[PDB]
Each structure stands twice: as structure tokens, then as C-alpha cells.
């Protein structure tokens, strides 16, 4: 009856930092996945355990749309079994990831001449992330064997770093908005469909 709010996720004025990625639960609506064919570049559109061609052929218990911003080189890390700063410490997909990854260049929106320091990412962490885990802590990373006392200094770094997007950066360093549609399959009425 009522269309799924994909506009709210893809057309958001400002995306979340990848370290504090945004999750929107999609439920109880008709899903015109077709309307996604907007934001024409769609620099990447890769689905897993499922095919894009006629995606409307399915029914799921729940859909999760994860949104964040990274830079061009790191889009390849948004994929199962990938490795690197983003996949290790910010947003990790599982090995058997069932869903899709959509990313497009937002250099016109997320870049500034003076540098856009709104978008951050996690640079250091004691360990890797579990799939779909989120760490938003701002505790000082300890590199030495001495305690940091909640302030950055020698061998003690603030764990979160900025991209500083500028419009004249190369394609690899330009900002890209990313959406990760996860498709949940449980033993439940499976109330997300639509022709």
C-alpha cells in the first residue's frame, strides 16, 4: 500500500561517517527497488546471494539499509571477505553476505574547497570488527605500554580521523556515498515484498 522510504536513505542531505554508519530498518512496505535507478552513476552496484535483474521477485522478513560515506579507493572494501581500514575497523560485511552494495560519487555534495572534515573514519582499534558491528567510541587509542589518561600524546592517538574532502582530489580520494541493502531471511511472516 505504502512505498518503502528509500528516498529518505539515498537522498539524505548528509550521510553518516563510516565509523558511525547509519542503519535504517525497512519493514511493512512495497519495495519499488526500481526507483533506485536514480543517482545515475551508481559507480558500483554489486549484489550477493541474489541478482539485481528483477530484484522484485522476492520476499523477506526484514531489510536493513546501511548508509555512510567513504572515499573512492575504499569502496572495494565494502564486500565480503575484504580487508583494510574500513573493513577491519568501520564496517565489516559477513562472508555469506546476502544483499547489495550501492555506491556513487558525491564530490559535488560532500567536498569543500576549505576541506570537509564532517566525515570521519576509525584508524586504530584493538581488534577487528565482527560483521555488522559498530564502534562509536572516542577513547584514546593506546600504542605504547603506558596509559594515555584520556588525552592524546606520545604513543597515544585519537582513534578517529577525517577525510578532509576537497573537490580537486583525484577520483580515488573523492567522497562516495554508499548504501548496503541487507536482506534478512528468518522464520517469520516475511512482510517485505512488492511487484
Amino acid at each position: 500500500t505504502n512505498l518503502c522510504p528509500f528516498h529518505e536513505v539515498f537522498n539524505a542531505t548528509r550521510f553518516a561517517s563510516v565509523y558511525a554508519w547509519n542503519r535504517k530498518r525497512i519493514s511493512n512496505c512495497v519495495a519499488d527497488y526500481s526507483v533506485l535507478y536514480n543517482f545515475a552513476p551508481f559507480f558500483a552496484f554489486k549484489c550477493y546471494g541474489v541478482s539485481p535483474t528483477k530484484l522484485n521477485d522476492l520476499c523477506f522478513t526484514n531489510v536493513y539499509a546501511d548508509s555512510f560515506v567513504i572515499r573512492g579507493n575504499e569502496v572495494s572494501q565494502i564486500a565480503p571477505g575484504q580487508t583494510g581500514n574500513i573493513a577491519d575497523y568501520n564496517y565489516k560485511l559477513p562472508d555469506d553476505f546476502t544483499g547489495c552494495v550501492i555506491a556513487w560519487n558525491s564530490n559535488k555534495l560532500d567536498s569543500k574547497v576549505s576541506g570537509n572534515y564532517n566525515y570521519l573514519y576509525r584508524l586504530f582499534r584493538k581488534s577487528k570488527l565482527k560483521p555488522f558491528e559498530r564502534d562509536i567510541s572516542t577513547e584514546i587509542y593506546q600504542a605504547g605500554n603506558k596509559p594515555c589518561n584520556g588525552v592524546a600524546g606520545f604513543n597515544c592517538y585519537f582513534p578517529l580521523q577525517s577525510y578532509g574532502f576537497r573537490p580537486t582530489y583525484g577520483v580515488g580520494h573523492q567522497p562516495y556515498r554508499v548504501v548496503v541493502l541487507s536482506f534478512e531471511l528468518l522464520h517469520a511472516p516475511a512482510t517485505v515484498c512488492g511487484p
Binding site: 576541506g115 584508524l123 586504530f124 600504542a143 605504547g144 605500554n145 606520545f154 604513543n155 592517538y157 580521523q161 577525517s162 578532509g164 576537497r166 580537486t168 582530489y169 583525484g170 577520483v171 580515488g172 580520494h173 573523492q174
Partner: protein, 596 residues
């Protein structure tokens, strides 16, 4: 938590902050050099200040990680570069004094001027006034006046400053655990901890001297031919067995003999191949020139220019009110931004310069994936050698024929090939004894082998002995003639111009071997050969990450700098010069001088 992983993480932080801070400094420098205002100067210095202060802060923090504790050579290389970027080694008082001296000598060189003896109101700077006389005037006395006035007026000011500069730079070097400042400079070629690729600082002296011996036959015949031609034009001023007077060499110091071509041209009846006319005929512009240069690098397998290159670069003079520093330079700002600043005119000179500067960009793009601290040529001579070989290939008549600027009508006779090699030898070969002899004098002064009261005595003994050049006027120790050259008074190493010259012909012979070129090496074009492009790329992507000896091997199959490819390039001229000097005295006598 080992002290190696703490350094791994310290470099992690450093790289990410450095690329952001370096970009702001690089872009502020770009905006000044392309749009000269009082405001853009402020930003350029402010961003440059925060970049320097960031580095000095990080050099201090990098020195807290003992280098010896790191097994990983990549990490050890990066920390070493950050720690030796520390001149927090002298006291604050001597550090302040040394910078003051460096600025004073720089100011004297850039602002010093001499005034004409007839008219004490008409005066001239080095650039553009005095250089104009040294490159164009055929008048003995006008050349003698400018040569002596520069040294006796500006050089004498620099003499006491250089004496204190030598002392403090040596104190800086000794406290950094080098023998002297010359030993410090030779550290750019040093390699440690890699078996079969090591290179010591003392080895550079021996390899420069060993290779220079093999140059002497070619130089002595070039010197003999040039002297014989100059004697015809200046019969009363030049001895047939003496050294060449220092003010008759084509520029202010004789660093290059390029401007002697008009008086020394072997076959002056033939033209120089100049496609400047054909380019204007076909209505080329700067865009077409750089599109053609981009096509050249694609033809060997290298990638084309990024989209931001065409958007952000300045390939023409903006003219009108907006002034720009028009010196052709290639910019690697970081974060994928690559630019070329060039006030291009539609000339063959600028068409070649485009290929040279785009060669720099190709090197910049190839090692862009390396860590920030390893994004440079393998040593100081690599980056310039890469640029030179591109203008070598693009200038050959084969390449000019294929791109349609030189019709198949033009037949290359053996005499334009001798005219071409003579002009090349005047620049490429004539500078090698000059470059070697100057840096040898500086190395000896820093080592303390030349006392202050024999500085100018030994400088002119070595000029006569090694370069075959004699001063036209005696100079006591109130002079400082080395400091009359930019690189000496502005604190730059000079041996890079010798090693780069040898590398570029080592590169070209290897790339032409991969391109299956048959014929003299000077006729070679590596266009349309992807094996040559691949062979070059394997070195380009290394940057500073591997020893320059190994990076050299990935191109040419040898671990050390070699002079044979240079002689191979100039062999046709060498056989002609030996023929030409049949009835002329080859060599020179050090005791003859033009001042009786």
C-alpha cells in the same frame, strides 16, 4: 607491544596528517605561482609555516624510536627520512645564525647588481641583464666586463658569508655523525642492510672519478674543436694550446656550452630541424601539444592523464593582469591531484618541454601508491633523468615524421646528424667537467683539504686542470667565484647533474634495446613499444621504496652508474671530432692565461 609496531602506528598517523597538510601547502603554492597577489603570498607562507612546523614536531617525535630496533627495512627507511629531516641538532643560536647567512647569500645573488663603467646610472641584475650578455654578446670586452663585475662586486660580498656557512654546515654534519657537509650530501646515494645492493658514501667519489676518466677523451676532443673554432673568431685572444677563457663559454660560468653553437657549428649551411613553423601551419595550440605528449606515453603502455590534470593545470599564460611564475614545473600535490604549470608557446622548444614535464608526472603517478615518505625518485638524479629521455625520443626525426610535423620529404644526411650531436655535446658533455670539478672543490673544502687562504687559488688550478678553462683576470682570496653560481650560494648539492646525465643514457639504451631499435642510439624513438614502457614502469612504481641500485637494475640490468651508454650516444661525433682535430693540438696547458 614492540618498539617496531609502535613505529608502524606512528607512521600511520604521520602519513594521514601529512598528505592533508602537504596538500594545503602545495595548493597554496600553486595559487601564488599561477595568480601572484599579496593575499596568495600570505596563504602560501601560512600553509608552508604549518607544514614545516608539523614536520619539525614529527622529526622530534620520530627520533624517540631507536632506528636499530626495527627489522623492517620499509619502516626503517621511513623513520630515517623523518629523523634526518631534523636539524634540531645545532643550538638554537647557531641554527638561527646559519639561516640568516643562507638568506643573506640568497638575497645578494637575487638582488645584487653591477653598474656600467661609462654610466653609473645604468645597472644590471644577473637575470635578465648579465645573463643576456653572457649568452648573446660576441664582444670580448663586454663579456669580460660582465664576467669580472659579477665576481668582483657580488662575489666579494659572499666570501665572508661562505666562510661562516662552511663552518656551521660542518658543525651540523659532524653532530649528525657525518665526516663533513660533503659527506652529508653524499648520503643521498647510501644504501645499507641489503646484501648485493649496498652503496657507501665514499663509493660515490670513486665511481664519479672512475667514470669521469672515461669521459676525458671525448671532452678533450670537444674542447680542442671548440678552441680551434673560437680561435678563428678571436685570433688575438685565444692560444692554440691554452685553456679557454672563462668569459667566452656561452653563459656566466661555462656550466653549459650551448650558446657556442653559432660559432662552433660544424656544417653551418644545413638547417636545424625546427618544426615550430609546421606547428603554427597546422594551427597547433598548447592543448594539442599536451594531447600529443599524452599520446606518446599511452603508446608505450603508460596511463593517460587524469581528469583533474586537464581541469586544474595551467598550460598557457593567463596573460593580461594575472601574472604567473612561468618556469615549467610538474606538480604532484598528492591525493590524486597532478598538474603542470607552463606558459606554453607554440614552439618546438615547448613541445619537447611538455614531454619532459609529463615524464615527471608519469613518475609521480607511478609511485603514488607508495607511502608518503617514499614518493620520490630513487635518488636525486632519477627524476630528472626520466624527464630528459622523453624529449630525446620526441625530438628524433622518426617521431616528428610520424606525428606529421616533418614530412617524409626531409632526408636526414650525415651532416645534420653531426650538427645535432655537436649541439647536444655542448650542453650534455660540456657540463660534466664543470659539474664534477665544482662539486669536487666543495667536497674538498668541507673535508678541510683546502685552507681558506688557498680557496680561490685551488678553484682556478682545478678549473685549468680539469675543465680546461682559465680565468681572464687574477683573483685573490677576497673573491668567492663558486658562490657566484646559484647552487653554491643557495645551498644545493651539484653532483646530481653529473649522475643524472649518466642515468638518462643508461635508461635510453635499455629502453631502446627493449624497443628493438637498430641503428645509432641517438636516432632512437621508444614510441609504440610497450616492452620499453613496462621496463621503465617497474622502476617508476618503486619510488624510494627500494635502493637506487636495485631500481637502476630493473631498467638497465646493472647495479651501478655507467658511462658507456653516454659514449655510445656520442660515438658518431667522437669519431668526427678525432678526424677534425687531425691537425690541431688536443689537450691544454695550464700555465697559459689571457692576462700575460
Amino acid at each position: 607491544s614492540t618498539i617496531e609496531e609502535q613505529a608502524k602506528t606512528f607512521l600511520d598517523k604521520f602519513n594521514h596528517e601529512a598528505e592533508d597538510l602537504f596538500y594545503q601547502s602545495s595548493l597554496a603554492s600553486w595559487n601564488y605561482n599561477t595568480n601572484i597577489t599579496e593575499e596568495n603570498v600570505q596563504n602560501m607562507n601560512n600553509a608552508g609555516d604549518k607544514w614545516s612546523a608539523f614536520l619539525k614536531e614529527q622529526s622530534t617525535l620520530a627520533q624517540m624510536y631507536p632506528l636499530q630496533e626495527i627489522q623492517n627495512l620499509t619502516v626503517k627507511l621511513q623513520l630515517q627520512a623523518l629523523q634526518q629531516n631534523g636539524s634540531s641538532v645545532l643550538s638554537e643560536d647557531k641554527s638561527k645564525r646559519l639561516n640568516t647567512i643562507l638568506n643573506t647569500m640568497s638575497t645578494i645573488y637575487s638582488t645584487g647588481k653591477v653598474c656600467n663603467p661609462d654610466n653609473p646610472q645604468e645597472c644590471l641584475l644577473l637575470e635578465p641583464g648579465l645573463n643576456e650578455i653572457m649568452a648573446n654578446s660576441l664582444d670580448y670586452n663586454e663579456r669580460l666586463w660582465a664576467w669580472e663585475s659579477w665576481r668582483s662586486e657580488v662575489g666579494k660580498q659572499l666570501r665572508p658569508l661562505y666562510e661562516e656557512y662552511v663552518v656551521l654546515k660542518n658543525e651540523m654534519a659532524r653532530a649528525n655523525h657525518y665526516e663533513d657537509y660533503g659527506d652529508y650530501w653524499r648520503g643521498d646515494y647510501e644504501v645499507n642492510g641489503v646484501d648485493g645492493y649496498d652503496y657507501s658514501r665514499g663509493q660515490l667519489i670513486e665511481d664519479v672519478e672512475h667514470t669521469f676518466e672515461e669521459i676525458k677523451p671525448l671532452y678533450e676532443h670537444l674542447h680542442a674543436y671548440v678552441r680551434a673554432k673560437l680561435m678563428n673568431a678571436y685570433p688575438s685572444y685565444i692560444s692554440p694550446i691554452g685553456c679557454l677563457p672563462a668569459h667566452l663559454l656561452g653563459d656566466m660560468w661555462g656550466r653549459f656550452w650551448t650558446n657556442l653553437y653559432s660559432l662552433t657549428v660544424p656544417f653551418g649551411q644545413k638547417p636545424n630541424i625546427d618544426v615550430t613553423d609546421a606547428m603554427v601551419d597546422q594551427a597547433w595550440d598548447a592543448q594539442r601539444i599536451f594531447k600529443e605528449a599524452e599520446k606518446f606515453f599511452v603508446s608505450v603502455g603508460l596511463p593517460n592523464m587524469t581528469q583533474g590534470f586537464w581541469e586544474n593545470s595551467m598550460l598557457t599564460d593567463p596573460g593580461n593582469v594575472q601574472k604567473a611564475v612561468c618556469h615549467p614545473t610538474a606538480w604532484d600535490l598528492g591525493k590524486g591531484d597532478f598538474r603542470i604549470l607552463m606558459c606554453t608557446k607554440v614552439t618546438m622548444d615547448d613541445f619537447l618541454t611538455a614531454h619532459h614535464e609529463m615524464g615527471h608526472i608519469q613518475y609521480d603517478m607511478a609511485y603514488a601508491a607508495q607511502p608518503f615518505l617514499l614518493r620520490n625518485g630513487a635518488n636525486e638524479g632519477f627524476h630528472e633523468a626520466v624527464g630528459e629521455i622523453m624529449s630525446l625520443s620526441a625530438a628524433t626525426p622518426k617521431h616528428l615524421k610520424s606525428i606529421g610535423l616533418l614530412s617524409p620529404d626531409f632526408q636526414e644526411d650525415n651532416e645534420t646528424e653531426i650538427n645535432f650531436l655537436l649541439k647536444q655535446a655542448l650542453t650534455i658533455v660540456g657540463t660534466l667537467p664543470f659539474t664534477y670539478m665544482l662539486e669536487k672543490w666543495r667536497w674538498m673544502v668541507f673535508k678541510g683539504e683546502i685552507p681558506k687562504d688557498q680557496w680561490m687559488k685551488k678553484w682556478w688550478e682545478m678549473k685549468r686542470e680539469i675543465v680546461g678553462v682559465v680565468e681572464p683576470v687574477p683573483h685573490d682570496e677576497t673573491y668567492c667565484d663558486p658562490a657566484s653560481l646559484f647552487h653554491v650560494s643557495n645551498d644545493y648539492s651539484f653532483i646530481r647533474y653529473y649522475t643524472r646525465t649518466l642515468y638518462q643514457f643508461q635508461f635510453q639504451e635499455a629502453l631502446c634495446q627493449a624497443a628493438k631499435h637498430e641503428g645509432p642510439l641517438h636516432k632512437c624513438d621508444i614510441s609504440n613499444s610497450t616492452e620499453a614502457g613496462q621496463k621503465l614502469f617497474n622502476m617508476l612504481r618503486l619510488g624510494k621504496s627500494e635502493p637506487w641500485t636495485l631500481a637502476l637494475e630493473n631498467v638497465v640490468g646493472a647495479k651501478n652508474m655507467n658511462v658507456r651508454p653516454l659514449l655510445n650516444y656520442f660515438e658518431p661525433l667522437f669519431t668526427w671530432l678525432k678526424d677534425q682535430n687531425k691537425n690541431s693540438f688536443v689537450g691544454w696547458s695550464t700555465d697559459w692565461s689571457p692576462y700575460a
